[PDB]
Structure formats: structure tokens, C-alpha cells
From Swiss-Prot, chains A, B:
Protein name: Serine/threonine-protein kinase Chk2
EC number(s) given by UniProt: 2.7.11.1
Binding partners and assembly: Homodimer. Homodimerization is part of the activation process but the dimer may dissociate following activation. Interacts with PML. Interacts with TP53. Interacts with RB1; phosphorylates RB1. Interacts with BRCA1. Interacts with CDC25A; phosphorylates CDC25A and mediates its degradation in response to ionizing radiation. Interacts with CUL1; mediates CHEK2 ubiquitination and regulation.
Sites of Phosphoserine modification: S149, S226
Expressed in which tissues: High expression is found in testis, spleen, colon and peripheral blood leukocytes. Low expression is found in other tissues.
Active site: D119
Family, per entry: Belongs to the protein kinase superfamily. CAMK Ser/Thr protein kinase family. CHK2 subfamily.
Amino acid sequence: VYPKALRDEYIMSKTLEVKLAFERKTCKKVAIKIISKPALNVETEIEILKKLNHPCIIKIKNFFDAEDYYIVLELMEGGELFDKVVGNKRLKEATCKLYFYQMLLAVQYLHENGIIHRDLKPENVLLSSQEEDCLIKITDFGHSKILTSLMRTLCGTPTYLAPEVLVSVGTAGYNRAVDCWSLGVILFICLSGYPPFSEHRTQVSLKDQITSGKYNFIPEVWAEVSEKALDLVKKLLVVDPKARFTTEEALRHPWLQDEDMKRKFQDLLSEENESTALPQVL
Amino acid sequence: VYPKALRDEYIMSKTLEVKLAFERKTCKKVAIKIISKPALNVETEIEILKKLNHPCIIKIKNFFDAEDYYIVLELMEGGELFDKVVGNKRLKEATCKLYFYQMLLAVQYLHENGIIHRDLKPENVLLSSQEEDCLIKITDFGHSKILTSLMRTLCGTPTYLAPEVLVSVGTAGYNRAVDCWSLGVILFICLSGYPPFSEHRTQVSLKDQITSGKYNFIPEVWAEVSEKALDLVKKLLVVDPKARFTTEEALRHPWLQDEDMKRKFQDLLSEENESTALPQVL
Ligand SMILES: NC(=O)c1ccc2nc(-c3ccc(Oc4cccc(O)c4)cc3)[nH]c2c1
Ligand SMILES: NC(=O)c1ccc2nc(-c3ccc(Oc4cccc(O)c4)cc3)[nH]c2c1
């Protein structure tokens, strides 16, 4: 059974673990994610969602800690990006750009605020409508990390410090680059309709494909895609973290210098804002 | 001022931040460590000390969380190992062996229980008496780490996983090796009376000395030390963590196959136990 306090504010409905629900007070739709009982993972997500404010990041509305873990969130009527790309379906380029531009803004915002998502994938990207022109929002912060001890060790004399810690200094502070990898893989999929790394018709093991950075390239498929779009993917799927493109570098790429796309984004953003916006002092 | 509850059980005395104190009930000496207010570091130490039980690991007796952080512990009348070695003083070999054997037992116990000290050094090693034949105990678990997510990532398909995480698998689970480095440096100091890595009369930077593993070797000094003892040091000051000696490998070294030393240890252990030991069913 659902906890009494939950039933008191919401009418639970169909499964979408995530199910649709209505807010009694307003009769509005909400999404409620359910997690059986890892307090820290849930605690981290709750901690993160409360403090964040960004159009391309999903908002928490309520939370209940009972027999299970119930998390109330905005409902995105478009569902998961995953459903758009599954089974070799491919989005048209301009649609990829509009979605990805928003994905970058979101992850940039996260990174600027010392948060690393660590689990970006099409099922964690939500669409705000059934229209293909729409707003996207990132979700699912269970696996996120918040940004130390190395800093603390460096302030002291390393008389007794093991050498592997000193060496590790050279690579520290590039954790957020993992998100940029996942982004590149998402963009590859969106643009082509198939994964860059897979155990389909290949002798090389998935791990080996990824570590070597040798994604499966199929000309026929990519022939329909621009060289700018592919270029950006090539810059995100860089094996070396230091060299890999950051969100900022991505947002400066010539593929995202598309004044139409940005305009259409402002529009969709404005429409969502309207009906939620108080009159302005002028 | 000291918190009322503290003064209620203890009479605070001289500074040794650590000061001597007496337990009202028993009139026994205790050591009380004081830390101004990093709850997590203190919390971790309290968490760790409560659960541990080992002769060469110091015991907590009480704790108070007030205007400051007060931690009550056993008093070691011998003070810090640091005072024995500071200013080029050097312990005789057999004394080094007896102390180090106990240091190994302690750190082995820690490691067996998923704890990494991370800050082993002569000031964190306490002597149970003013005699040079005595028991040692490790202390100060503020910086300790308790042993994951990598395991969790490996259970899933790495379709979106960045390559640096996969690579990191090859080096994971060797964190405890940092303690074995620190141990080697402690033993070097004890045996020779001088640090293996230092900015004394050398052009090479401390960091560079450590990463290259090239400790400063002074024949005249080491000529008085056995080849077995030096050998063990050479095996702990290995730059490569995988290859570095573990506590177990250390305890099997020919330098520690010394039946006299072990005997003298059993004795000291027995003496401490006596007066704390209930009559046995026989
Ligand atoms: N794991 C998450 O953090 C998370 C958080 C929130 C989520 N909302 C959906 C979702 C939304 C809409 C779907 O189609 C529908 C179904 C019913 C009505 C509707 O308008 C759209 C399907 C799934 N998936 C979510 C995942
Ligand atoms: N940082 C720690 O975790 C810690 C924890 C416990 C510690 N006890 C001493 C210590 C003990 C004895 C000393 O000489 C004396 C002083 C008075 C009486 C006596 O018998 C010995 C000096 C320092 N240092 C400690 C450090």
C-alpha cells in the first residue's frame, strides 16, 4: 500500500519505478519515482534536486520517506529520449542540435555547481512534450557525485606520503569529463540511430572498443549527417580526459553556432515560463 | 572552559591538542584529545575506535560533543615514537624490530577490517612505557578511509561509460598500499635516524625523490644495520603499489622471523593483560 501521507496529497495512477499521479489540490499531473529500501543515494538526489534551479534540469515537488522512498517530480509529457532512438530510429539533425544544446546547458550548469551526473543516457533525458520541437530536462541524480583530501594532503609536507598520491595530482579534477564522454555517446546515437560501441558484428570486446576509442563508423549512415556534427562527436569521444572537450568548448563548437535553433529554444522556454510568471515592475 | 559533563567525570590537567586527565571514579590517568569545530573526520574516528579491538591499537574510553570535540583515550606513558627518533637519535635494531612487528600487526588488522589509516608517522605511534622494551599502539584515525561504486558500475553494461573508469579498474583495490609506504619510511627512520626523503643537501625536489623512489642512502650510517633489515625497507619503498610488500608479506620477511622478539612481545602483552583479566574456567 501507498503511505497515508502520500495518498493525502496525491492520487496515484499508472506506472510509466515511476508512476503517474495527480495533485489533489491542483489536479495537476506529477511523476513519482519509487525506490525500495541505500539512503545515501536517495539522500544525495534529494539534496541535489532541492538546490538546483535550471530549465533543463527536472524539479522536485515533494518527497516521502516511508515503507519505501517516494520522490515527486515534474511530469514530462514527452517521456524518455530513449523511446525516440530505440530500434534504430534516428532524429533529424536539427532536432539533435536542439536537444543537445539543452543537454550541454544542463551539464554545464551541473559542472559549474560542482556536481557530476555520472549516469547520462537517453533514458535519463526527458522531453517536455510529444512534439519533436520541445524542451528537454535531465533527471536521475542517484549516482551523482558532489565535489577534497588531496588538497589537504598537498598543504602538508609529503615526508611519509606514498608516490601514487603525488602522481595522482596530475590527473585530479577531471572527473566531470566522464559526463562529456556520455554526452558524446548520446549525440552519436541521436545522429546515427546506432551505438558507437557495441558487441554487434565485431570481434573486439566492448571494453577494448571503448578504451581504444575506436567507435564503429558506418559511412552509409553518416553520409546523411553534416561534417560539423560529426566533428563535435569526434571531439567528445576523445580517450584522454585532459584533451576531451568540456561543455564550454562544446557550446562554442561551430555546430552549435545556429541562431535559428537558439531562437526556437528561447521560444519554448518562454512558453513554459508563461502562466508561471508574475507581472513585472517596469 | 571545559564542558560541565566532562568536568563531572574527569579532572583536566597538563597539555601533552592532547592533555592529561584523571578519571574521578578510578583516579586513573587518561589522554584527552581536543578538536575545535569537521564533524565527519571526528565522526569517522569515533566510528572507527568504537569497533576496533587490538592490543596495538589505542582504545577510546569516552567522547564529548560540545563547544569543542573531546575524545578520551588510554594514556600511553611512553609518549610518541617521534620523540625517540627526532634529532638524529636512532633506536637499536632489535628495538626497531619489536616496534615494527607491532606496527605491522596493527596495520594488518586495520587492513583486514577494511580500514586505511592514511597518516602513519612516528607521532601517531604511541609507546606504552618509558622502557625501550614496551608495547606500541597506533592512534589518530581522523584521516582514515573505510572500504564501492566501481563494483556497481562493472555490473552494468558500459555502453555510456567513459574509458578512464574502465582503465581505473586495473589499479583499484590497492589503496591500503599507501599505509605500507608510510611504514617503510618509518622503519627507514627508526633504523638510521634520518629520513629517506628530504630537502637536506640535495638538488632534487622532495616530490621527485619520492616519485622516483630514490631515497638518500648513506653507507656509513647503514653499515651498522643488518642486510635483512635494509632488505625489508627496500621492499616496502617500492614505487609500484601492486609490487609493494603488503603487511602479510612483511610479516613473513626473514627479518621478522625472530623468535626472541616475538617472545618478548608475548610477555609485554601478558603483563598488560594481567590485572585486566578475569579468572578462567578450566
Ligand atoms: N529515473 C528518473 O529520475 C525519472 C524521473 C522522471 C521520469 N518521467 C518519466 C516518464 C514521463 C512521461 C512518460 O510518458 C508519459 C506517460 C503518461 C503521460 C504522459 O504525459 C507521458 C513516460 C516516462 N521517466 C522518468 C525518470
Ligand atoms: N593524535 C592522537 O590521536 C593521539 C592520542 C593519544 C596521545 N597521547 C599522547 C602522549 C602520551 C604521553 C606523553 O608523555 C607523557 C606525559 C604525561 C604522562 C605520561 O605518562 C607521558 C606525551 C603524549 N599523544 C597522543 C596523540
